[PDB]
Protein backbone atom coordinates (compact mmCIF):
# COMPACT_ATOMS: atom_id res chain seq x y z
CA UNK A 1 0.00 0.00 0.00
CA UNK A 2 1.26 3.54 -0.59
CA UNK A 3 1.66 4.38 3.08
CA UNK A 4 1.57 1.23 5.16
CA UNK A 5 0.95 1.52 8.91
CA UNK A 6 3.03 -1.65 9.49
CA UNK A 7 6.27 -0.07 8.17
CA UNK A 8 5.54 3.04 10.28
CA UNK A 9 4.94 0.77 13.31
CA UNK A 10 8.15 -1.11 12.44
CA UNK A 11 10.01 2.22 12.58
CA UNK A 12 8.64 2.74 16.10
CA UNK A 13 9.68 -0.75 17.31
CA UNK A 14 13.10 -0.53 15.63
CA UNK A 15 14.51 2.43 17.56
CA UNK A 16 12.45 1.83 20.62
CA UNK A 17 21.14 15.95 40.63
CA UNK A 18 19.49 18.28 38.07
CA UNK A 19 16.59 16.69 36.11
CA UNK A 20 16.99 19.28 33.34
CA UNK A 21 20.58 18.09 32.77
CA UNK A 22 19.17 14.55 32.47
CA UNK A 23 16.39 15.70 30.15
CA UNK A 24 18.96 17.54 28.00
CA UNK A 25 21.26 14.49 28.17
CA UNK A 26 18.44 12.23 26.92
CA UNK A 27 17.54 14.75 24.19
CA UNK A 28 20.93 14.78 22.49
CA UNK A 29 20.83 10.99 22.76
CA UNK A 30 17.40 10.55 21.17
CA UNK A 31 18.38 12.93 18.39
CA UNK A 32 20.61 10.24 16.87
CA UNK A 33 17.89 7.58 17.25
CA UNK A 34 15.36 10.01 15.67
CA UNK A 35 17.43 10.29 12.49
CA UNK A 36 17.40 6.46 12.43
CA UNK A 37 13.65 6.45 12.98
CA UNK A 38 12.98 8.90 10.11
CA UNK A 39 15.14 6.88 7.68
CA UNK A 40 12.87 3.88 8.39
CA UNK A 41 9.77 5.97 7.48
CA UNK A 42 8.35 5.32 3.95
CA UNK A 43 9.49 7.77 1.24
CA UNK A 44 11.39 9.97 3.73
CA UNK A 45 14.85 8.73 2.71
CA UNK A 46 13.95 9.38 -0.93
CA UNK A 47 13.24 13.09 -0.38
CA UNK A 48 16.23 15.31 -1.21
CA UNK A 49 18.79 15.64 1.61
CA UNK A 50 18.12 19.38 2.13
CA UNK A 51 14.39 18.71 2.57
CA UNK A 52 15.24 15.84 4.94
CA UNK A 53 17.36 18.26 7.02
CA UNK A 54 14.59 20.89 7.00
CA UNK A 55 12.00 18.32 8.24
CA UNK A 56 14.00 17.00 11.22
CA UNK A 57 15.25 20.49 12.24
CA UNK A 58 11.60 21.58 12.14
CA UNK A 59 10.11 18.51 13.79
CA UNK A 60 12.59 16.97 16.22
CA UNK A 61 11.01 18.51 19.35
CA UNK A 62 7.44 17.54 18.60
CA UNK A 63 8.71 14.18 17.30
CA UNK A 64 10.73 13.70 20.49
CA UNK A 65 8.10 15.09 22.84
CA UNK A 66 5.47 12.74 21.44
CA UNK A 67 7.78 9.77 21.99
CA UNK A 68 8.54 10.35 25.67
CA UNK A 69 4.90 11.31 26.29
CA UNK A 70 3.82 7.91 24.95
CA UNK A 71 6.59 6.05 26.76
CA UNK A 72 5.23 7.72 29.92
CA UNK A 73 1.67 6.28 29.62
CA UNK A 74 2.88 3.78 32.23
CA UNK A 75 4.09 6.06 35.05
CA UNK A 76 1.76 7.73 37.58
CA UNK A 77 3.25 11.25 37.85
CA UNK A 78 6.46 11.69 35.92
CA UNK A 79 8.07 11.02 32.56
CA UNK A 80 10.35 8.19 31.50
CA UNK A 81 13.49 9.05 29.53
CA UNK A 82 15.32 6.81 27.03
CA UNK A 83 18.44 6.93 29.23
CA UNK A 84 16.35 4.69 31.55
CA UNK A 85 15.91 7.67 33.90
CA UNK A 86 12.57 8.83 35.34
CA UNK A 87 11.78 12.49 35.97
CA UNK A 88 9.05 12.92 38.59
CA UNK A 89 6.51 15.76 38.72
CA UNK A 90 7.93 16.98 42.07
CA UNK A 91 11.50 16.67 40.79
CA UNK A 92 10.61 18.80 37.75
CA UNK A 93 8.83 21.34 39.93
CA UNK A 94 11.82 21.53 42.27
CA UNK A 95 14.03 22.35 39.24
CA UNK A 96 11.82 25.24 38.13
CA UNK A 97 10.22 23.60 35.07
CA UNK A 98 6.89 22.48 36.58
CA UNK A 99 4.74 24.65 34.30
CA UNK A 100 5.63 22.94 31.01
CA UNK A 101 6.06 19.49 32.63
CA UNK A 102 2.43 19.61 33.83
CA UNK A 103 1.23 20.55 30.32
CA UNK A 104 3.02 17.51 28.88
CA UNK A 105 1.37 15.34 31.56
CA UNK A 106 -2.25 16.60 31.26
CA UNK A 107 -2.53 17.43 27.53
CA UNK A 108 -0.36 14.69 26.06
CA UNK A 109 0.50 11.90 28.51
CA UNK A 110 -2.96 11.84 30.09
CA UNK A 111 -4.84 12.08 26.81
CA UNK A 112 -2.65 9.34 25.37
CA UNK A 113 -3.34 7.19 28.47
CA UNK A 114 -7.10 7.95 28.38
CA UNK A 115 -7.57 6.78 24.78
CA UNK A 116 -5.06 3.91 24.93
CA UNK A 117 -3.30 5.28 21.85
CA UNK A 118 -1.35 2.43 20.27
CA UNK A 119 2.18 2.64 18.83
CA UNK A 120 0.78 2.62 15.28
CA UNK A 121 -1.35 5.68 16.03
CA UNK A 122 1.63 7.35 17.73
CA UNK A 123 3.93 6.51 14.79
CA UNK A 124 1.57 7.92 12.17
CA UNK A 125 1.11 11.10 14.20
CA UNK A 126 4.88 11.53 14.38
CA UNK A 127 4.99 10.69 10.65
CA UNK A 128 2.40 13.43 10.11
CA UNK A 129 4.57 15.79 12.19
CA UNK A 130 7.68 14.66 10.31
CA UNK A 131 5.99 15.50 7.00
CA UNK A 132 5.16 19.14 7.79
CA UNK A 133 4.48 20.85 4.41
CA UNK A 134 4.49 24.19 6.27
CA UNK A 135 8.27 23.87 6.74
CA UNK A 136 10.13 26.88 5.30
CA UNK A 137 12.67 26.47 2.50
CA UNK A 138 11.35 23.11 1.28
CA UNK A 139 12.18 22.40 -2.38
CA UNK A 140 8.97 20.46 -2.86
CA UNK A 141 6.13 21.16 -0.35
CA UNK A 142 3.62 19.65 -2.82
CA UNK A 143 5.41 16.33 -2.33
CA UNK A 144 5.48 16.75 1.45
CA UNK A 145 1.78 17.70 1.41
CA UNK A 146 1.11 14.49 -0.56
CA UNK A 147 3.13 12.27 1.80
CA UNK A 148 1.43 13.55 4.96
CA UNK A 149 -1.87 13.04 3.14
CA UNK A 150 -0.91 9.40 2.46
CA UNK A 151 0.00 8.92 6.14
CA UNK A 152 -3.29 10.25 7.54
CA UNK A 153 -5.45 8.52 4.90
CA UNK A 154 -3.80 5.31 6.08
CA UNK A 155 -4.45 6.47 9.65
CA UNK A 156 -8.17 6.88 9.05
CA UNK A 157 -8.41 3.39 7.49
CA UNK A 158 -6.66 1.86 10.51
CA UNK A 159 -8.79 3.81 13.03
CA UNK A 160 -11.95 2.73 11.16
CA UNK A 161 -10.69 -0.88 11.10
CA UNK A 162 -9.01 -1.37 14.50
CA UNK A 163 -11.35 0.76 16.63
CA UNK A 164 -14.53 0.95 14.50
CA UNK A 165 -16.66 1.44 17.66
CA UNK A 166 -15.23 4.93 18.21
CA UNK A 167 -16.10 7.08 15.13
CA UNK A 168 -14.47 10.18 16.65
CA UNK A 169 -11.12 8.47 17.23
CA UNK A 170 -9.37 9.53 14.00
CA UNK A 171 -10.10 13.22 14.68
CA UNK A 172 -9.31 12.89 18.40
CA UNK A 173 -5.76 11.75 17.52
CA UNK A 174 -5.00 14.59 15.10
CA UNK A 175 -6.52 16.96 17.67
CA UNK A 176 -3.50 16.39 19.95
CA UNK A 177 -1.37 18.09 17.30
CA UNK A 178 -2.19 21.71 18.08
CA UNK A 179 -1.32 20.77 21.70
CA UNK A 180 1.95 19.06 20.70
CA UNK A 181 2.77 22.15 18.60
CA UNK A 182 2.09 24.52 21.50
CA UNK A 183 4.05 22.28 23.90
CA UNK A 184 6.90 21.93 21.37
CA UNK A 185 7.46 25.69 21.16
CA UNK A 186 7.15 26.32 24.90
CA UNK A 187 9.56 23.44 25.48
CA UNK A 188 11.98 24.82 22.84
CA UNK A 189 12.07 28.25 24.56
CA UNK A 190 13.34 26.52 27.72
CA UNK A 191 16.20 24.97 25.74
CA UNK A 192 17.24 28.35 24.34
CA UNK A 193 17.27 29.79 27.86
CA UNK A 194 19.22 26.76 29.23
CA UNK A 195 21.81 27.65 26.59
CA UNK A 196 21.86 31.45 27.13
CA UNK A 197 22.50 31.11 30.89
CA UNK A 198 24.92 28.20 30.23
CA UNK A 199 24.02 26.59 33.59
CA UNK A 200 23.28 23.26 31.93
CA UNK A 201 25.70 21.26 29.74
CA UNK A 202 24.31 20.78 26.23
CA UNK A 203 25.85 18.08 24.05
CA UNK A 204 26.94 18.53 20.42
CA UNK A 205 23.94 17.13 18.49
CA UNK A 206 21.40 18.99 20.67
CA UNK A 207 23.51 22.13 20.31
CA UNK A 208 23.32 21.78 16.51
CA UNK A 209 19.49 21.79 16.46
CA UNK A 210 19.09 24.96 18.54
CA UNK A 211 21.81 26.77 16.59
CA UNK A 212 20.86 29.22 13.82
CA UNK A 213 20.07 28.75 10.10
CA UNK B 1 25.11 21.84 10.60
CA UNK B 2 27.56 18.89 10.36
CA UNK B 3 26.34 15.96 12.51
CA UNK B 4 22.87 15.76 10.96
CA UNK B 5 24.16 15.53 7.36
CA UNK B 6 26.62 12.77 8.27
CA UNK B 7 23.80 10.76 9.85
CA UNK B 8 21.25 11.20 7.04
CA UNK B 9 23.95 9.33 5.12
CA UNK B 10 23.70 5.58 5.98
CA UNK C 1 -25.62 16.87 13.50
CA UNK C 2 -28.82 16.82 15.59
CA UNK C 3 -27.16 18.03 18.82
CA UNK C 4 -24.65 20.38 17.09
CA UNK C 5 -26.03 21.43 13.67
CA UNK C 6 -23.71 22.71 10.93
CA UNK C 7 -26.51 25.01 9.71
CA UNK C 8 -26.49 26.93 13.01
CA UNK C 9 -22.70 27.02 13.16
CA UNK C 10 -22.75 28.75 9.77
CA UNK C 11 -25.54 31.05 11.01
CA UNK C 12 -23.21 32.23 13.77
CA UNK C 13 -20.60 33.01 11.10
CA UNK C 14 -23.16 34.70 8.85
CA UNK C 15 -24.57 36.56 11.86
CA UNK C 16 -21.22 38.25 12.53
CA UNK C 17 -20.06 39.06 8.96
CA UNK C 18 -18.46 42.55 8.86
CA UNK C 19 -1.92 54.45 9.58
CA UNK C 20 0.69 52.12 11.10
CA UNK C 21 -0.48 48.70 9.79
CA UNK C 22 -0.03 47.17 13.26
CA UNK C 23 -2.18 49.96 14.83
CA UNK C 24 -4.90 49.04 12.32
CA UNK C 25 -4.52 45.36 13.17
CA UNK C 26 -4.95 46.05 16.91
CA UNK C 27 -8.01 48.32 16.45
CA UNK C 28 -9.45 45.58 14.24
CA UNK C 29 -8.64 42.99 16.95
CA UNK C 30 -10.51 45.16 19.47
CA UNK C 31 -13.59 45.65 17.32
CA UNK C 32 -13.47 41.92 16.66
CA UNK C 33 -13.39 40.83 20.29
CA UNK C 34 -16.86 42.31 21.00
CA UNK C 35 -18.23 40.53 17.96
CA UNK C 36 -16.50 37.23 18.77
CA UNK C 37 -18.60 37.15 21.95
CA UNK C 38 -21.86 37.29 19.91
CA UNK C 39 -20.49 34.68 17.49
CA UNK C 40 -19.74 32.34 20.40
CA UNK C 41 -23.15 33.06 22.01
CA UNK C 42 -24.58 31.78 18.73
CA UNK C 43 -22.51 28.58 18.82
CA UNK C 44 -24.86 25.80 20.01
CA UNK C 45 -24.62 25.11 23.76
CA UNK C 46 -22.00 27.79 24.43
CA UNK C 47 -24.21 29.99 26.64
CA UNK C 48 -25.36 26.91 28.62
CA UNK C 49 -21.81 26.48 30.00
CA UNK C 50 -20.89 27.96 33.43
CA UNK C 51 -20.16 31.68 32.96
CA UNK C 52 -16.55 31.28 34.17
CA UNK C 53 -15.86 28.57 31.55
CA UNK C 54 -17.19 30.86 28.78
CA UNK C 55 -14.67 33.44 30.03
CA UNK C 56 -11.81 30.90 30.11
CA UNK C 57 -12.46 29.44 26.64
CA UNK C 58 -12.54 32.92 25.09
CA UNK C 59 -9.52 34.13 27.08
CA UNK C 60 -7.76 31.09 25.63
CA UNK C 61 -9.14 30.99 22.10
CA UNK C 62 -9.56 34.55 21.01
CA UNK C 63 -6.35 34.55 19.17
CA UNK C 64 -6.67 31.61 16.85
CA UNK C 65 -10.26 32.53 16.57
CA UNK C 66 -9.73 36.09 15.26
CA UNK C 67 -6.81 34.96 13.10
CA UNK C 68 -8.84 32.07 11.58
CA UNK C 69 -11.67 34.40 10.53
CA UNK C 70 -9.53 37.12 8.88
CA UNK C 71 -7.39 34.50 7.12
CA UNK C 72 -10.49 33.02 5.45
CA UNK C 73 -11.68 36.58 4.84
CA UNK C 74 -8.43 37.17 2.94
CA UNK C 75 -8.73 34.47 0.25
CA UNK C 76 -10.24 37.07 -2.12
CA UNK C 77 -7.17 39.31 -1.79
CA UNK C 78 -3.86 38.54 -3.51
CA UNK C 79 -1.05 39.69 -1.18
CA UNK C 80 -2.53 40.97 2.08
CA UNK C 81 -5.40 40.61 4.53
CA UNK C 82 -8.90 41.98 4.66
CA UNK C 83 -9.45 43.40 8.13
CA UNK C 84 -12.99 43.43 9.51
CA UNK C 85 -12.82 47.24 9.57
CA UNK C 86 -12.94 47.27 5.76
CA UNK C 87 -9.22 47.89 5.44
CA UNK C 88 -6.57 45.88 3.58
CA UNK C 89 -3.04 45.19 4.78
CA UNK C 90 -0.57 44.40 1.97
CA UNK C 91 2.47 42.27 2.85
CA UNK C 92 4.74 45.21 1.98
CA UNK C 93 3.04 47.38 4.61
CA UNK C 94 3.58 44.43 6.98
CA UNK C 95 7.28 44.06 6.14
CA UNK C 96 7.70 47.86 6.33
CA UNK C 97 6.20 47.51 9.82
CA UNK C 98 8.61 44.84 11.04
CA UNK C 99 5.77 42.28 11.12
CA UNK C 100 6.82 40.86 7.72
CA UNK C 101 7.69 37.32 8.86
CA UNK C 102 4.52 36.59 10.89
CA UNK C 103 2.36 38.13 8.16
CA UNK C 104 4.17 35.84 5.73
CA UNK C 105 3.41 32.95 8.08
CA UNK C 106 -0.24 34.07 7.88
CA UNK C 107 -0.07 34.24 4.06
CA UNK C 108 1.64 30.86 3.50
CA UNK C 109 0.31 28.59 6.27
CA UNK C 110 -3.26 29.91 6.54
CA UNK C 111 -4.78 32.08 3.78
CA UNK C 112 -3.18 30.24 0.83
CA UNK C 113 -4.21 26.86 2.22
CA UNK C 114 -7.80 28.03 2.80
CA UNK C 115 -7.88 29.08 -0.88
CA UNK C 116 -6.18 25.99 -2.34
CA UNK C 117 -8.92 23.83 -0.81
CA UNK C 118 -11.82 26.28 -1.26
CA UNK C 119 -12.63 26.11 2.47
CA UNK C 120 -16.23 27.24 2.90
CA UNK C 121 -17.89 29.29 5.68
CA UNK C 122 -19.28 26.15 7.37
CA UNK C 123 -15.85 24.51 7.55
CA UNK C 124 -14.51 27.79 8.92
CA UNK C 125 -17.31 27.95 11.50
CA UNK C 126 -16.71 24.33 12.48
CA UNK C 127 -12.95 24.83 12.86
CA UNK C 128 -13.60 27.96 14.93
CA UNK C 129 -16.11 25.97 17.00
CA UNK C 130 -13.40 23.37 17.67
CA UNK C 131 -10.96 26.12 18.75
CA UNK C 132 -13.61 27.62 21.04
CA UNK C 133 -14.26 24.28 22.75
CA UNK C 134 -10.66 23.74 23.92
CA UNK C 135 -10.46 21.17 26.76
CA UNK C 136 -6.82 21.98 27.41
CA UNK C 137 -7.71 25.39 28.63
CA UNK C 138 -6.65 25.72 32.17
CA UNK C 139 -9.12 26.43 34.83
CA UNK C 140 -12.24 24.82 33.31
CA UNK C 141 -14.80 23.55 35.83
CA UNK C 142 -15.68 20.59 33.58
CA UNK C 143 -13.13 20.00 30.76
CA UNK C 144 -15.05 16.82 29.74
CA UNK C 145 -18.21 18.79 28.83
CA UNK C 146 -16.05 21.04 26.63
CA UNK C 147 -14.52 17.89 25.10
CA UNK C 148 -18.01 16.46 24.50
CA UNK C 149 -18.90 19.59 22.50
CA UNK C 150 -15.55 19.43 20.71
CA UNK C 151 -16.57 15.87 19.70
CA UNK C 152 -20.01 17.13 18.58
CA UNK C 153 -18.50 19.93 16.45
CA UNK C 154 -16.00 17.67 14.66
CA UNK C 155 -18.49 14.84 14.24
CA UNK C 156 -20.79 17.30 12.46
CA UNK C 157 -17.94 18.79 10.42
CA UNK C 158 -16.73 15.38 9.19
CA UNK C 159 -20.29 14.41 8.29
CA UNK C 160 -20.70 17.73 6.43
CA UNK C 161 -17.48 17.14 4.47
CA UNK C 162 -18.50 13.53 3.73
CA UNK C 163 -21.92 14.69 2.53
CA UNK C 164 -20.98 17.81 0.55
CA UNK C 165 -17.44 16.99 -0.64
CA UNK C 166 -17.59 13.18 -1.18
CA UNK C 167 -14.80 13.32 -3.80
CA UNK C 168 -12.36 14.48 -1.08
CA UNK C 169 -11.97 11.59 1.42
CA UNK C 170 -9.22 13.44 3.29
CA UNK C 171 -10.74 16.93 3.37
CA UNK C 172 -11.86 16.63 7.00
CA UNK C 173 -8.29 15.84 8.15
CA UNK C 174 -6.85 18.64 5.96
CA UNK C 175 -9.04 21.10 7.91
CA UNK C 176 -7.94 19.72 11.31
CA UNK C 177 -4.26 19.83 10.33
CA UNK C 178 -4.59 23.58 9.77
CA UNK C 179 -4.75 23.86 13.57
CA UNK C 180 -1.09 23.39 14.37
CA UNK C 181 -0.43 26.33 11.98
CA UNK C 182 -3.23 28.31 13.64
CA UNK C 183 -2.04 27.54 17.16
CA UNK C 184 1.58 28.15 16.15
CA UNK C 185 0.85 31.47 14.44
CA UNK C 186 -1.60 32.44 17.20
CA UNK C 187 1.26 32.21 19.70
CA UNK C 188 3.57 34.32 17.55
CA UNK C 189 0.95 37.05 17.12
CA UNK C 190 0.44 37.01 20.88
CA UNK C 191 4.19 37.31 21.46
CA UNK C 192 4.18 40.38 19.19
CA UNK C 193 1.06 41.79 20.89
CA UNK C 194 2.94 41.63 24.22
CA UNK C 195 5.92 43.40 22.71
CA UNK C 196 3.75 46.16 21.24
CA UNK C 197 2.37 46.45 24.80
CA UNK C 198 5.82 46.25 26.50
CA UNK C 199 7.23 48.86 24.15
CA UNK C 200 4.76 51.73 24.48
CA UNK C 201 4.16 52.90 20.90
CA UNK C 202 1.01 51.05 19.78
CA UNK C 203 -2.55 52.14 20.72
CA UNK C 204 -4.20 49.22 22.51
CA UNK C 205 -7.93 49.33 23.32
CA UNK C 206 -9.62 48.18 26.54
CA UNK C 207 -10.82 44.76 25.32
CA UNK C 208 -7.50 43.91 23.64
CA UNK C 209 -5.73 45.12 26.78
CA UNK C 210 -8.00 43.08 29.08
CA UNK C 211 -7.12 40.03 26.95
CA UNK C 212 -3.40 40.89 27.16
CA UNK C 213 -3.61 40.67 30.96
CA UNK C 214 -2.16 37.84 33.08
CA UNK C 215 -4.95 35.58 34.48
CA UNK D 1 -12.06 40.76 33.26
CA UNK D 2 -14.70 43.49 33.30
CA UNK D 3 -15.81 43.64 29.64
CA UNK D 4 -15.98 39.91 28.86
CA UNK D 5 -18.27 39.14 31.84
CA UNK D 6 -20.50 42.12 30.97
CA UNK D 7 -20.75 41.17 27.30
CA UNK D 8 -21.47 37.51 28.05
CA UNK D 9 -24.29 38.22 30.52
CA UNK D 10 -26.98 40.19 28.64
C1 LIG E 1 13.65 11.96 26.19
C2 LIG E 1 13.17 13.31 25.75
C3 LIG E 1 14.19 14.30 25.76
C4 LIG E 1 13.63 15.68 25.34
C5 LIG E 1 13.33 15.93 24.01
C6 LIG E 1 12.84 17.18 23.63
C7 LIG E 1 12.65 18.18 24.59
O1 LIG E 1 12.17 19.38 24.18
C8 LIG E 1 12.94 17.94 25.93
C9 LIG E 1 12.76 18.93 26.91
C10 LIG E 1 11.69 18.86 27.81
C11 LIG E 1 11.51 19.85 28.80
C12 LIG E 1 10.34 19.78 29.79
C13 LIG E 1 10.08 18.46 30.16
C14 LIG E 1 9.03 17.76 29.57
C15 LIG E 1 12.41 20.92 28.88
C16 LIG E 1 13.48 20.99 27.98
C17 LIG E 1 13.65 20.00 27.01
O2 LIG E 1 14.69 20.09 26.15
C18 LIG E 1 13.44 16.68 26.29
C1 LIG F 1 -9.37 41.20 12.81
C2 LIG F 1 -8.38 40.91 13.82
C3 LIG F 1 -7.06 41.26 13.54
C4 LIG F 1 -6.04 40.55 14.45
C5 LIG F 1 -6.42 39.78 15.55
C6 LIG F 1 -5.45 39.16 16.34
C7 LIG F 1 -4.10 39.31 16.04
O1 LIG F 1 -3.19 38.69 16.83
C8 LIG F 1 -3.69 40.07 14.95
C9 LIG F 1 -2.34 40.26 14.60
C10 LIG F 1 -1.87 39.90 13.32
C11 LIG F 1 -0.54 40.12 12.95
C12 LIG F 1 -0.05 39.71 11.55
C13 LIG F 1 -0.97 40.11 10.59
C14 LIG F 1 -1.66 39.15 9.86
C15 LIG F 1 0.36 40.70 13.85
C16 LIG F 1 -0.09 41.06 15.12
C17 LIG F 1 -1.42 40.85 15.48
O2 LIG F 1 -1.83 41.22 16.72
C18 LIG F 1 -4.68 40.68 14.17
Numbering used by the authors:
A (entry chain C): 228 to 243, 262 to 458
B (entry chain D), D (entry chain B): 1 to 10
C (entry chain A): 227 to 244, 262 to 458
What does the paper say about this structure?
Nuclear receptors are ligand-regulated transcription factors, involving multiple signalling pathways, among which RXRα and PPARγ are in the central positions. Once activated by their agonists, RXRα and PPARγ translocate into the nucleus forming RXRα:RXRα homodimer or RXRα:PPARγ heterodimer, which subsequently binds to RXRE or PPRE to initial their target genes transcription, respectively. Interestingly, we find that magnolol is a dual agonist of both RXRα and PPARγ.
RXRα plays its role in diverse physiological processes, including cell development, apoptosis, and homeostasis. Different from previously reported RXRα agonists, magnolol possesses two identical 5-allyl-2-hydroxyphenyl moieties. To reveal the molecular basis for magnolol binding and activating RXRα, we determine the crystal structure of RXRαLBD-magnolol complex with SRC1 coactivator peptide. Magnolol-bound RXRαLBD exhibits a dimeric packing of RXRα. In RXRαLBD-magnolol structure, the hydroxyl group of magnolol contacts with Asn306 in helix 5 of RXRα. Although magnolol is big enough to accommodate mostly the L-shaped RXRα ligand-binding pocket, two magnolol molecules have to cooperatively occupy the much larger Y-shaped PPARγ ligand-binding pocket.
